[PDB]
């Protein structure tokens, strides 16, 4: 019955400080933790509050960079991590105790909030086409692609033929470059005497730069 | 400070144990809480109180305690239980919650599948904007793990390589992909360029070579 729900996704520059929110729809004998989880990994506790005894909890890790604090008025609870770090990028979770103690099962779960710490800059992806030849056919088939290059933010989206093709498509996730910027590339396998009938053309959409390439893929 | 292995392999209804490995502190003297986490989502609570069950979980998982260690059971074990899991307990001496790195729930098992394996050449706009990029592309391969290496000529090159992580796809398989970025003049000067990908102490390479 009761949701939190958290504000969403952030990019941050190392050293800057980041707010999250957690808004309980609905639904406060309850204590409140914040969780996070930095990709590919576990669960890290970063503290709590528990609004009806007006007392938080740091993990002493955090302490000294970190503040939650709960507003009554709007039961939302807020989570600010400040002088943050690479290691800071997680997802971060608010999550509602079955009772005021910490020690009590974490019940209620937020949705989460992705948190990206890195020194680069929005940045618009350059796109190269894959050309399909003889040394991407076998058996008839012919794998053509789009290769999405130095770009950040994340997300980039990928479509073929504006959505009309579908089936045999295969797109990568992301590599994180040492440049700090993304690529990912996105193929599809089609029939090769589709060749010369069908023309074939990746829609990549980069919405943090406002940006959308539609790239013809040609012999 | 919590221990669990990173992995438990079973096969369908049967039972697998996790365990969950504390100190006097935290385990010894406080509740044990578990959590089951569906790939991209939210953890869930599946165990509270050492033994307890909330509303809408299943039977087919218990939990124990006993001295400084835990147990989460899962018996008529299916696919819906692979997840990660987690125990969790307060910790008095760090005054703060801890939880395990966690348990991969390998259920078993897909049929081993070989990589397929596409390399592509740098393109020409790429080339005539003065970059180059081979692009080797990974998929349907099970289970998920590979390794690649790249070679200029005969000889192994490192420099210029980036890899992702393996993701597992629509169809249970995983994928991965692997860069190497070169000048327009390393491209040209060599013969061919090769990607090869190591799965289960079998390899599959792909060759390319300036037009």
């Known amino acids: 019955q009761v949701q939190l729900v958290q504000s969403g996704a952030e990019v941050k520059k190392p050293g800057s400080s980041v707010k999250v929110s957690c808004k309980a729809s609905?639904?406060?004998?309850?204590?409140i933790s914040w969780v996070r989880q930095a990709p590919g990994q576990g669960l890290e506790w970063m503290g709590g509050?528990?609004?009806?005894?007006?007392?938080?909890n740091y993990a002493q890790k955090f302490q000294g960079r970190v503040t939650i604090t709960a507003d009554e008025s709007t039961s939302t609870a807020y989570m600010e991590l400040s002088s943050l770090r690479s290691e800071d990028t997680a997802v971060y979770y608010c999550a509602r105790h079955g009772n005021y103690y910490y020690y009590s099962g974490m019940d209620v779960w937020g949705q989460g909030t992705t948190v990206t710490v890195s020194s680069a800059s929005t940045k618009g992806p350059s796109v190269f086409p894959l050309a399909p030849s003889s040394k991407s056919t076998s058996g008839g088939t012919a794998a053509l692609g789009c290769l999405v290059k130095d770009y950040f933010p994340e997300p980039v989206t990928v479509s073929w033929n504006s959505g009309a093709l579908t089936s045999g498509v295969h797109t990568f996730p992301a590599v994180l470059q040492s440049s700090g910027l993304y690529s990912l590339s996105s193929v599809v396998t089609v029939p090769s005497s589709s060749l010369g009938t069908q023309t074939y053309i990746c829609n990549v959409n980069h919405k943090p730069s406002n940006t959308k390439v539609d790239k013809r893929v040609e012999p | 400070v919590l221990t669990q292995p990173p992995s438990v392999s079973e096969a369908p209804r049967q039972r697998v144990t996790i365990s969950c490995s504390g100190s006097?502190?935290?385990?010894?003297?406080?509740?044990v809480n578990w959590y089951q986490q569906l790939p991209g989502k939210a953890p869930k609570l599946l165990i509270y109180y050492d033994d307890l069950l909330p509303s809408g979980v299943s039977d087919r998982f218990s939990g124990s305690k006993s001295g400084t260690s835990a147990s989460l059971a899962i018996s008529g074990l299916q696919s819906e239980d692979e997840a990660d899991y987690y125990c969790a307990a307060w910790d008095d001496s760090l005054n703060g919650a801890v939880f395990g790195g966690g348990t991969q729930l390998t259920v078993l098992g897909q049929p081993k599948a070989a990589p397929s394996v596409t390399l592509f050449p740098p393109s020409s706009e790429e080339l005539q904007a003065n970059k180059a990029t081979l692009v080797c592309l990974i998929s349907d391969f099970y289970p998920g793990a590979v390794t690649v290496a790249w070679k200029a000529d005969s000889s192994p090159v490192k420099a210029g390589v980036e890899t992702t992580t393996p993701s597992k796809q629509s169809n249970n398989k995983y994928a991965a992909s692997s860069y190497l970025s070169l000048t327009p003049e390393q491209w040209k000067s060599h013969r061919s360029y090769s990607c090869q990908v190591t799965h289960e102490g079998s390899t599959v390479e792909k060759t390319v070579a300036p037009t």
């Open positions: 006097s502190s935290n385990i010894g003297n406080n509740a």
């Open positions: 609905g639904g406060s004998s309850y204590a």
């Open positions: 509050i528990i609004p009806i005894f007006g007392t938080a």
